[PDB]
């Protein structure tokens, strides 16, 4: 039922509104992705609010969690779309904006693009199911927290454990085979932190020099990044890992 609910609140595909008549310069590609991110942020916030348990958290905890995990959420979903639509060969940012070798090159962030493609490749290797993906995505929203704790810690812990259990349900082969899959899927979850660290570094860097580098960011993103950046830079957040 919880899983059936996740299927129901899963956001509909978001288009980039990309204009292919324009040259694919780094400035245009990055600005287009930032605009896409803004549109995706709207879907993310709406999705989170509809998530069983999220509403029970303090308003500040809700904002904090979205602020710290939006990049991981979008990168993970990108990995899923690329997996389903291109078997992990291209980055399916949006139906109207798919990154091939050429775009990855002109984006000036080829390596980060490959890091994200590696996620899709893991989905392929493990043949991640839609149910597993849905539960894992919720866990990402609940895997980067303030070092000083949350206001509704108790409720948070309970929520997190519920979705972890839901994930094991999706996984459920004998018990040892289920354990192995839990091990592998949570290894994938933990791997998101390092990738996201690199994604956020370039995001913050281009954000800080948005005007000078002519890389546009929509208001939906500017507000969030403006607040998130200092917190992250000061080392106020920490990951909730599944492995040593
Ligand atoms: C959210 C984003 C787009 C939507 C989506 O499906 C998946 C992602 C993940 C990668 C993200 C992009 C988008 O932020 C453009 C970037 C974020 O600013 C890059 C910039 O720094 C551009 O200035 C670095 C990391 C990129
Ligand atoms: Na908080
Ligand atoms: Na792989």
Structure notes:
This protein has 244 residues and is mainly α. It has a single domain, classed as Retinoid X Receptor, CATH 1.10.565.10. 69% of the residues lie in helices and 5% in strands. It has a two-stranded antiparallel sheet with strand order 1-2. The longest helix has 34 residues, at 175-208. It is globular and about 50 Å long. The structure holds aldosterone and sodium ion (2 copies).
Find the CATH superfamily: Retinoid X Receptor
State the end-to-end CA separation: 32 Å
- Estimated share of beta-strand residues: 5-15%
Count of the separate structural domains: 1
Count of DSSP H/I helices: 10
CATH class: Mainly Alpha
CATH architecture: Orthogonal Bundle
* String of helices and strands: HHHEEHHHEHHHHE
Could you say which overall geometry the principal axes of the C-alpha atoms support? globular
CATH topology assignment: Retinoid X Receptor
Count of individual beta strands: 4
Report the bound ligands by name, code or SMILES.
aldosterone, sodium ion
Strand order of the biggest β-sheet? 1-2
**How much helix, percentage-wise, in residues?**
55-70%
Oligomeric state as shown: monomer
Give the class from helix and strand content and strand pairing: mainly alpha
Return Rg in Å: 18 Å
What topology does this entry show?
Layout lengths: L1 H8 L16 H25 L8 H28 L4 E4 L2 E3 L1 H6 L3 H17 L3 H12 L2 E3 L6 H19 L3 H34 L1 H4 L5 H15 L3 E3 L5
Antiparallel strand pairs: 1-2, 3-4
Helix pairs in contact: 2-3, 3-5, 3-6, 3-8, 5-8, 6-7
Bound molecules: aldosterone and sodium ion (2 copies).
């Amino acid at each position: 039922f919880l899983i059936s609910i996740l299927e129901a609140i899963e956001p509909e595909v978001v288009y980039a509104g990309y204009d292919n008549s324009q040259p694919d310069t780094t400035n245009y590609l990055l600005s287009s992705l930032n605009r896409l991110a803004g549109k995706q942020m709207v879907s993310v916030v709406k999705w989170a609010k509809a998530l069983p348990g999220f509403r029970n958290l303090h308003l500040d905890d809700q904002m904090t969690l979205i602020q710290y995990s939006w990049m991981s959420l979008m990168a993970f979903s990108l990995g899923w779309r690329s997996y389903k639509h291109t078997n992990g060969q291209m980055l399916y940012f949006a139906p109207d904006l798919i990154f091939n070798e050429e775009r990855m090159q002109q984006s000036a962030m080829y390596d980060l693009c490959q890091g994200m493609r590696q996620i899709s490749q893991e989905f392929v290797r493990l043949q991640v199911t839609y149910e597993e993906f849905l539960c894992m995505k919720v866990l990402l929203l609940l895997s980067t927290v303030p070092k000083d704790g949350l206001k509704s810690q108790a409720s948070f812990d309970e929520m997190r454990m519920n979705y972890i259990k839901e994930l094991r349900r999706a996984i459920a082969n004998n018990s040892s085979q289920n354990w192995q899959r839990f091990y592998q899927l949570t290894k994938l979850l933990d791997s998101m932190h390092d990738l996201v660290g690199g994604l956020l570094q370039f995001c913050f860097y281009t954000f800080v020099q948005s005007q000078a580098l002519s890389v546009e960011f929509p208001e939906m993103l500017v507000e969030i990044i403006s607040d998130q950046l200092p917190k992250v830079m000061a080392g106020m957040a920490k990951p909730l890992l599944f492995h040593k």
